């Protein structure tokens, strides 16, 4: 069976092109992926983008009651074998840490930070801390929910495409080139299809776009 589809794990990330640079071993104006700057020194490459924000929070936070029951059908059984609604979103602690106190925990979903140093004692925001991936799947498991959204960063990007835990990953497109000094990790694309792309957008002067890629 597959895990990434029975619990609907779903990754979105937004990526911007990279700024280059005059010295260092990391220039790449050739780079075979234009869009792959995640973030750069904790925070978000470019400047707030509110279009993408708007998209983001649409997406991690809309949940179809209708559907549920499918799903919770789909889940039962697969658990069968083995043997107010929100979506999850699950995040690495930089990620969590670079988000603003006055807008953790996100609200109107299940907020998972996946830590092995983080404790309960520290984070009094409302939000499981998880200590791998695993763990996370062990929750999923036992946790009534609409879809489970890998929202960052790189490094839980990696983990998951690795484990082809991913059924479709929600891409954001920022046409703008900054500074970045972590990029959305390489995996088999020959695994996905885009299933969706959107017109195009303009965010104070920057264009941008969002594609959706399913798993084949
Ligand atoms: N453009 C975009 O869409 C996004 C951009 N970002 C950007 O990316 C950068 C942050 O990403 P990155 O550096 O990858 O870090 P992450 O945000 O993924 O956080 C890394 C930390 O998360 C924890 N972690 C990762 N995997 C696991 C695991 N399997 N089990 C338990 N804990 C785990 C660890 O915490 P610990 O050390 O406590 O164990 C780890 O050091 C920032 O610059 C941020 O602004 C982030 C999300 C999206
Ligand atoms: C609004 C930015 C954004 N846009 C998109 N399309 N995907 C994301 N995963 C994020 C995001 C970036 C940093 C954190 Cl900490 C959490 C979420």
């Given at each position: 069976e597959n895990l990434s589809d029975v619990f609907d794990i779903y990754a979105i990330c937004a990526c911007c092109k990279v700024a280059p640079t005059s010295?260092?071993?990391?220039?790449?104006?050739?780079?075979?992926?234009?869009?792959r700057g995640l973030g750069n020194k904790g925070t978000?490459?470019?400047?707030?983008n509110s279009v993408d924000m708007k998209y983001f929070s649409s997406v991690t936070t809309y949940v179809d009651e209708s559907k549920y029951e499918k799903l919770k059908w789909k889940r039962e059984r697969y658990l069968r074998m083995e043997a107010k609604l929100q979506n999850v979103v699950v995040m690495g602690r930089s990620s969590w840490e670079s988000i603003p106190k006055q807008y953790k925990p996100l609200p109107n979903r299940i907020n998972v930070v996946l830590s092995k140093t983080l404790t309960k004692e520290d984070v009094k925001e409302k939000v499981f801390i998880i200590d791998s991936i695993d763990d996370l799947l062990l929750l999923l498991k036992k946790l009534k929910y609409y879809k489970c959204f890998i929202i960052g960063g790189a490094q839980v990007y990696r983990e998951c495409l690795s484990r082809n835990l991913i059924k479709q990953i929600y891409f954001t497109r920022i046409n703008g080139a900054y500074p970045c000094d972590v990029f959305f990790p390489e995996f088999?694309?020959?695994?996905?299809?885009?299933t969706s792309v959107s017109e195009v957008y303009n965010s104070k002067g920057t264009t941008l776009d969002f594609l959706v890629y399913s798993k084949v």
């Open positions: 010295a260092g071993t990391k220039n790449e104006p050739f780079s075979p992926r234009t869009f978000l490459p470019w400047k707030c088999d694309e020959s695994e996905f299809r885009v």
